[PDB]
Amino acid sequence: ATKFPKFSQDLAQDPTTRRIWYAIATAHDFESHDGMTEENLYQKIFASHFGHLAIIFLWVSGSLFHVAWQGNFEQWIQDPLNTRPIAHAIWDPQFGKAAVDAFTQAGASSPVDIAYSGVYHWWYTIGMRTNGDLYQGAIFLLVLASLALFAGWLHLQPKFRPSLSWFKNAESRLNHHLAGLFGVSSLAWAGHLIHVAIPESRGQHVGWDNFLSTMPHPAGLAPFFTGNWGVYAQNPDTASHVFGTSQGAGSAILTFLGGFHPQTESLWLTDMAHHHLAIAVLFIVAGHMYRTQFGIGHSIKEMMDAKDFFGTKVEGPFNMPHQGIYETYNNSLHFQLGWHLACLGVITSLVAQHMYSLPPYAFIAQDHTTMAALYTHHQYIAGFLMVGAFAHGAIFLVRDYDPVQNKGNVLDRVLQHKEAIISHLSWVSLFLGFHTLGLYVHNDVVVAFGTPEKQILIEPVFAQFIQAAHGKLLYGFDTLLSNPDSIAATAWPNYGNVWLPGWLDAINSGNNSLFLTIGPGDFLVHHAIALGLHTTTLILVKGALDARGSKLMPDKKDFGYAFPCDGPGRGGTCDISAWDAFYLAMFWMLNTIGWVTFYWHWKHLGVWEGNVAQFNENSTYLMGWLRDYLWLNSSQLINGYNPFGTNNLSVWAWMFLFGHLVWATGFMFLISWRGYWQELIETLVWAHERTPLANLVRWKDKPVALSIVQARLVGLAHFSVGYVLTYAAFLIASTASKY
């Protein structure tokens, strides 16, 4: 045997190379390790969380330090529309002189990378103005990572290891996260915005050296111990305000103007501080809800077990049986993980959908490439998180679901009618797919034969009506908030809209991306998204719900989450496992997010260049997507290096080709399967053992082919890496060669 892996003796007595590979893939599956108890399990979870927190802090520290050290932060401060932000310096000894000249950009003397995270805009919006502020933030995050590392180490010391009853205290955690994390952290951020970010927006330096001696409001802390709150909102920052300077500077610190700052092109900072105040107060109230140890409070378990509505029968909350769902939630870490990843994926996607249309940062809507990168990044993260949510739901259903403790409740009735669930998911998937592919191919065929008038073009009149209901008078609906006389517009009893002038100018001045104009191309694409979401959901739900057992395999719970198959018997059982359904749905999620990001990017290129007719006339067939979006915009990307020389796009051309290579390399692992490679490695073993001067050196682990699940994972990882790198290369180069 070998020492490695310590956590699994089954892999430790393995004499093959597989012992290494599986160990790397089972190092974080703590429950399946040898000698695992629930106590030590949960404590390891806690310390790994602290370690991850420290990694996050080190990462932000690195970004801040490289911008402060090798970036052009202050040069970008003085001219944020015409200066490229520098990520970090390049040190590649293999560069020729042409690549040194080509990467000497953004006012630098050396080769540098252009930052496309938008971190410059977010740091400029939050009051950071010199290199010293960023350097201080970098060292402070270096301190915070150290504190997180020490806390993770401490909570595994014998005296400081938290008890299992502490970990299972959902009431206390909910209260302290809603009011402490979610509430007090938002209160503190409103405090930062009011105390620092708004003064630096108005030209004033409120550093750590004078914040105790600088009042936020000219007669401040008097109006809000008296109910005179409106004094903090009397003179808002003027529409002639120049950001970072006192020219036209107002003095309000909490407004509800609505719409955008006109020069900075983002939302108002005072409006953000007021939002954060409202959110903090609401979240402290929400965290004042559950019964921890002071008698007052709610308890979730009693609500889940409640069957009494003031004398009525009620099966439970909403007359739906809910017994043991508290126990199911709190005892299964995989249920918790699946739920929390679903919530996280939803809000990450909401972040993506809200930042492009409500830009929150100074002049970030003018940095088109960073906006593209941020939308695409957060949508891909959201897709990955949703797939992980459903994967851990499946893992919970194979490893933690007790039908006895869930006998009767909502989860049991879902498991009752899982076939109707999966079948109607199949129906809506086929529905959407058949019709969207059909309308697209009809448009393609009639445009091909020189007849674009025969295109089935369907206006998104429901979403256009919603846009009108937000205030866009372009469509001519004359409905709520686009009629000045609707009771929604005037708010008849209180007359307290006040957001509405700013928002109405925002919605009815096309210079932004707030509720962009949509047409039949947008209809067809949104149905492609609907198809993609439904089919990825279908794969993941069929995997999770039919993971405990199938009609083909009615003992699938006993084989675990990941297993290759049940063999070629019973008709053939390739990819029967619940891991394999995750593996299938990852491709579908990648395709769906590629669709959403293609849509976003082509529409925004048409909007930024002003040629919106390009999208509104060519996105209805699918050669428009190939010619006017994929073939065209790659043109500068692919000339990143040519026989005539190297541009600064040589990185993105090289990474474009590299992503194509990784993506195609994955196809090898996904298409060719194991026994071929095992038979080939057998001949290689024979050749090595019968070669003179080579038989003197022998392997310590016997060479075997990759396992079935392993190479499924390897091909999926290669496919995903190639997918992501290829699209990131195309996005950055097609959006950075112009704007």
Binding site: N319, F462, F465, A469, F477, D478, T479, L480
Partner: peptide, 27 residues
Amino acid sequence: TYTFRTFWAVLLLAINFLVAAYYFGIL
């Protein structure tokens, strides 16, 4: 006898038809 579920579905249908009346200019 389907009373609870019918009430909730009828409520949701009523919200749908209220938005439809907004759409068609009746409201």
